[PDB]
Amino acid sequence: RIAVIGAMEEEVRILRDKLEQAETETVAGCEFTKGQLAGHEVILLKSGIGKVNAAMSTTILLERYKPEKVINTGSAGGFHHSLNVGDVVISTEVRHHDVDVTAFNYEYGQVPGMPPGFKADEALVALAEKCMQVVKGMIATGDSFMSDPNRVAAIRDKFENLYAVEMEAAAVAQVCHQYEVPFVIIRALSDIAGKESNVSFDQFLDQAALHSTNFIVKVLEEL
Amino acid sequence: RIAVIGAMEEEVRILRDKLEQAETETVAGCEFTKGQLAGHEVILLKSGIGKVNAAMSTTILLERYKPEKVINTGSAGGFHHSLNVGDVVISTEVRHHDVDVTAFNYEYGQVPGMPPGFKADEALVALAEKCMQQVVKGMIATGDSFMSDPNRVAAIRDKFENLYAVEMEAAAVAQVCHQYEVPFVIIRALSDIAGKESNVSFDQFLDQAALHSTNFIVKVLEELKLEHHHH
Numbered sequence A: 001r002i003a004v005i006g007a008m009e010e011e012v013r014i015l016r017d018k019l020e021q022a023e024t025e026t027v028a029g030c031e032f033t034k035g036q037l038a039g040h041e042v043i044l045l046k047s048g049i050g051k052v053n054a055a056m057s058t059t060i061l062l063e064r065y066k067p068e069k070v071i072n073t074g075s076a077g078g079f080h081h082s083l084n085v086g087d088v089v090i091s092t093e094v095r096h097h098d099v100d101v102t103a104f105n106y107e108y109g110q111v112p113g114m115p116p117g118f119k120a121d122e123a124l125v126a127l128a129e130k131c132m133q134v135v136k137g138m139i140a141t142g143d144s145f146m147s148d149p150n151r152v153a154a155i156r157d158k159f160e161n162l163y164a165v166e167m168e169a170a171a172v173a174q175v176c177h178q179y180e181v182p183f184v185i186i187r188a189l190s191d192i193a194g195k196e197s198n199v200s201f202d203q204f205l206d207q208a209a210l211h212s213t214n215f216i217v218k219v220l221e222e223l
Numbered sequence B: 001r002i003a004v005i006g007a008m009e010e011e012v013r014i015l016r017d018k019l020e021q022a023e024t025e026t027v028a029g030c031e032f033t034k035g036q037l038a039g040h041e042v043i044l045l046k047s048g049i050g051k052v053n054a055a056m057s058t059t060i061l062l063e064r065y066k067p068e069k070v071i072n073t074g075s076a077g078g079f080h081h082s083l084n085v086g087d088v089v090i091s092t093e094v095r096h097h098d099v100d101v102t103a104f105n106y107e108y109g110q111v112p113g114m115p116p117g118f119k120a121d122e123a124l125v126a127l128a129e130k131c132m133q134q135v136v137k138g139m140i141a142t143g144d145s146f147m148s149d150p151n152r153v154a155a156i157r158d159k160f161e162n163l164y165a166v167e168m169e170a171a172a173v174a175q176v177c178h179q180y181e182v183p184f185v186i187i188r189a190l191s192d193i194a195g196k197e198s199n200v201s202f203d204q205f206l207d208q209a210a211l212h213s214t215n216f217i218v219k220v221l222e223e224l225k226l227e228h229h230h231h
């Protein structure tokens, strides 16, 4: 009934240990752990990294498990100047930052036949809000780790006030969009995109998993 | 039994009219037409444009229909300097051109946990080779962008060994098939030359690209007739 999707082992292991009556099964190399948490039937999925992994894995989830709602968790790169490593971000909206079909007058980041961005579920956002350092804002995804400052600068000028950046959210949202399943992204910051990113990431990935997981647990507890 | 995937309507409509006993069904806004062609059970899928669309749609195909082999068709942007609009390219290998996790020492284009590229099926490539008698065989790389910007094109040139064509689905298809362990091959035709007058050329020669790609695929399909050769 409720799905939580994380890319890496560190981002899911915390939740997986809290699950009870855990029954794990692998499909196309993707781990699906199914159990009980906060009186919910929770389908935990390790999606792997990147758009295609997330899209494939999210599709398998929606085909086989049919969850009513979907939450995407894990680390992300800080983009807005107010935010620090450790901070949690709830998705208001999700976009691709590396999509460019502007040669056919789709606005930057817009996949053809898709809306320019994917709005997260109002009910889930409202709920997350009550449990709110946690912030609410736009998350954009690309198939790259944003460690290059130039790449980060190139993205700044394309969106209104991007909060965080990562590599799965938009794939998750876009799939959910077409299946018409409510979604929300809840991730924590492992680093600041473009600033010593990968050294910071290795240092604070476990922290990001922890903060993200704990907020999700309280949202579940509250849902 | 055999799946053929294409992103736009122009890239599938040609095939879809050749199908017999056609029975179409929509899943998550994706068209799946199922019928008979060249004595094969052919699942025709309009995937939509882009990596996520292709990945989702390919996954639905593999979950629901369980095809033994997968072919990806449609238009593509010419990258190698010998090739012209109209030319057909068979995938030797497929890569992402817009993937960069080199901060963790994956080579450029390599998605983490994936091989640097996805080799197409040897049997399918060998078969396609025979039917080449302009058709060529080479690497195809995918990104979530239409490569009309010359700068974007130049940036890619220096990353791969001798890229032939670029588009927006092949690597998603291959990566899914990779993990499902389903043989695949990309067979696309050139609508334009990436970075040149790409979108004006594309609108002009998309139908031609669909046609050439579809016809080659039909004769590759027809070339079985090789599981028997009797008839």
Ligand SMILES: Nc1ncnc2[nH]cnc12
Residues within 6 Å of the ligand: A075, A076, A077, A078, A144, A145, A146, A147, A165, A166, A167, A190, A191, A192, A193, A194, A197, A201
């Ligand atoms: N955690 C993260 N995920 C994706 N891209 C990033 N760039 C910097 N940090 C990142």
Ligand SMILES: Nc1ncnc2[nH]cnc12
Residues within 6 Å of the ligand: B075, B076, B077, B078, B145, B146, B147, B148, B166, B167, B168, B191, B192, B193, B194, B195, B198, B202
């Ligand atoms: N047909 C095509 N597909 C994707 N990218 C391109 N760039 C130029 N032509 C293209």
